[PDB]
């Protein structure tokens, strides 16, 4: 096909009033990430990982809001196929990178707490760069097959091209979609838990790790809520499902810069 006609389907009567929270959240996220990157322009590995997280988060947020805002305001609901594939790949790759960055931050905190005297000699600008490149390469490689698999095979009740939503237009893609979740997100939980049990097994030094727990709580718990509502949420009408997905995707960009 040439174009896709995107469509909150239940609340089709009033649409201007719904766009105010999304516009405000996008502006807040953009301003916070811009300030966080500007302040660095503090040369410590943890701050490097924080900067990478902020940059990836900002680029992810800027790739979904404008289409939704345009649909809400200008009622221009046509998206080219190439744009849909690009948006899908960008969204999924940036979610994977964000998870990888969180894992790297946890590792840095562990190596700081358990080895306070060998913290600099172990983490070297070269090794940190290699770790970051490895995380980016893993995310890109694991996100690269999705557009190809979809292109191997016209109304979307959503606001952006989601792979699960687009795939409804079956029994094979879901296996890989579940495998990738338990490789870049499922393994992050295990490694973070193992890096926290080891730290606690080892007071002021334990309070520096407090801010990093809030980010995990604000980024993982919405994911668990979305997973539960995407597997047992049948009685709820679809517009609630759309609002919940948008909120779960958008509020971590709002919360992250305000915490750090």
């Amino acid at each position: 096909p040439s174009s896709f006609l995107l469509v909150i389907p239940g609340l089709e009567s009033v649409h201007i009033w719904i766009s105010i929270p999304f516009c405000a959240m996008y502006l807040i996220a953009l301003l916070g990430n811009s300030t966080l990157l500007f302040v660095i322009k503090l040369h410590e590995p943890m701050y490097y990982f924080l900067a990478m997280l902020a940059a990836t988060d900002l680029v992810l947020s800027t790739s979904t809001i404008p289409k939704m805002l345009a649909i809400f305001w200008f009622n221009l609901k046509e998206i080219s196929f190439d744009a849909c594939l690009t948006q899908m790949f960008f969204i999924h790759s940036f979610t994977g990178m964000e998870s990888g960055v969180l894992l790297a931050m946890a590792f840095d905190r562990y190596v700081a707490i358990c080895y306070p005297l060998r913290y600099t000699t172990i983490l070297t600008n070269k090794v940190i760069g290699k770790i970051g490149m490895a995380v980016v390469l893993r995310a890109v490689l694991l996100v690269i097959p999705f557009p190809f698999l979809l292109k191997r095979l016209n109304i979307i009740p959503h606001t952006y091209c989601e792979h699960m939503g687009v795939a409804k237009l079956i029994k094979v893609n879901i296996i890989y979609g579940l495998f990738v979740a338990l490789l870049i997100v499922g393994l992050d939980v295990i490694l973070i838990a193992l890096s926290y049990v080891l730290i606690l097994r080892a007071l002021k030094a334990l309070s520096t790790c407090g801010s990093h727990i809030c980010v995990i709580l604000a980024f993982y718990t919405p994911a668990f809520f979305s997973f539960l509502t995407h597997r047992f949420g049948h009685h709820i009408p679809p517009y609630i499902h759309i609002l919940l997905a948008n909120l779960y995707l958008l509020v971590p960009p709002m919360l992250n810069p305000i915490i750090y």
Side-chain angles (χ1 to χ4, degrees), residues 1-2 4-7 9-10 16 18 21-22 24 26-27 29 32-33 37 39-40 45 47 49 51 53-57 60 65-67 70 72 81-85 89 91-92 94 96 99-104 106-107 110-112 114-116 119 127 129 132 134 136 139-140 145-150 156-161 163 165 167 177-178 181-182 186 192-193 196-198 200 202 205-206 209-210 212 215-216 218-220 222-223 233 237-238 241-242 245-246 249 252-253 256-257 259-260:
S2 64
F4 274 173
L5 297 173
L6 295 174
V7 152
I16 300 291
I18 310 181
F22 288 161
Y26 173 65
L27 286 178
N33 278 295
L37 267 283
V39 77
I40 293 172
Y47 273 62
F49 307 129
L53 160 73
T56 289
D57 158 81
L60 171 57
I65 298 300
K67 193 45 171 209
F72 283 168
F81 181 90
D82 300 0
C84 184
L85 283 208
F89 176 75
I91 283 181
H92 289 297
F94 288 153
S99 193
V101 175
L102 289 188
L103 169 36
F107 175 70
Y110 153 63
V111 85
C114 282
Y115 297 100
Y119 170 81
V127 179
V136 166
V140 164
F146 278 110
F148 165 85
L149 171 138
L150 183 95
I156 310 181
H158 213 330
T159 41
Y160 66 87
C161 278
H163 171 280
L178 191 78
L182 265 75
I192 288 166
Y196 267 79
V197 152
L198 275 183
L200 206 150
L206 272 293
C209 188
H212 179 274
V215 162
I216 287 174
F219 180 89
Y220 280 44
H241 297 165
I242 305 304
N246 265 290
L249 181 63
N256 289 358
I259 296 189
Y260 273 108

